């Protein structure tokens, strides 16, 4: 996360870290949507251009975390993956269209002050809230900047980072890039004229873009961190998987096939 701040304890209790067993490393963010289901970006698991094609046993999910590198004894819960489900029309060839994946946990995770699921949006909540200018919140452990001077500056955070960002008008998203944008994406970030900055960055992939509904005061995951060109570049925006647009696939995966 670029130009964010340290999260408060328990601020994002659905935040999930995707962790490579060997070598032990952060792969991506993710989010908890029930006691057995974790949502992330397809490209966190499958990206042939980078020879990336992870199997269940390659990965753990760590839930309830705050510190990036510490093992948070008595707080985090580390879970093994039962199954990975990638959207069958995930377009890794061109533009990361439908950048979404589910992970089933081998065992349900116990909820706590630090571990709690986020809601997924229904049509009405998405229609009300996914409006240009409305702000959501992005969280992750990814890099603090696109570039820095090695062993002199600092590019990675000690703990979970948070930034609030406004949804951007679709023509502005489209005019910011040569990549083909789809209805399964929205973009977010401040314009150069606006005062403020902020973006996701490498390692934030797959984590949640959330909004707090003013109707029922619940947090809804509207987006998944998907792609950008650079991080926090002027005139560029971060692009997010439109969770509601893919919810019928989510429901199918959970309701008919996985339950």
């Amino acid at each position: 996360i670029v130009e964010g701040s340290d999260a408060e304890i328990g601020m994002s209790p659905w935040q999930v870290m995707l962790f490579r067993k060997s070598p032990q490393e952060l792969l991506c963010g993710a989010s908890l949507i029930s006691d057995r289901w974790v949502l992330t970006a397809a490209h966190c698991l499958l990206y042939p251009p980078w020879d990336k094609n992870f199997t269940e046993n390659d990965l753990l999910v760590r839930i309830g975390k705050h510190s990036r590198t510490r093992y948070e004894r008595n707080i985090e819960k580390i879970s093994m993956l039962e199954k990975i489900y990638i959207h069958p029309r995930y377009n890794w060839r061109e533009n990361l269209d439908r950048d979404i994946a589910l992970m089933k946990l081998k065992k349900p995770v116990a909820f706590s002050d630090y571990i709690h699921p986020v809601c997924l949006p229904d049509r009405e909540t998405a229609a009300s809230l996914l409006q240009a200018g409305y702000k959501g919140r992005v969280t992750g452990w990814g890099n603090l900047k696109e570039t820095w001077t090695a062993n002199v500056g600092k590019g990675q955070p000690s703990v979970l980072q948070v930034v609030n960002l406004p949804i951007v008008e679709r023509p502005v998203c489209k005019d910011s890039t040569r990549i083909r944008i789809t209805d399964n994406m929205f973009c977010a970030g401040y314009k150069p004229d606006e005062g403020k900055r902020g973006d996701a960055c490498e390692g934030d992939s797959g984590g949640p873009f959330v909004m707090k509904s003013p109707f029922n005061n619940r947090w809804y995951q509207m987006g998944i961190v998907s792609w950008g060109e650079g991080c926090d570049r002027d005139g560029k925006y971060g692009f997010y998987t439109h969770v509601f647009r893919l919810k019928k696939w989510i429901q199918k995966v959970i309701d008919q096939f996985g339950e």
Binding site: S22, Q24, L26, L60, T69, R70, Y71, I78, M80
Partner: peptide, 12 residues
């Protein structure tokens, strides 16, 4: 290697 080691039961 920035990462504090995980309990062994998880890496199995």
């Amino acid at each position: 290697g920035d990462f504090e080691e995980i309990p062994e039961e998880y890496l199995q």
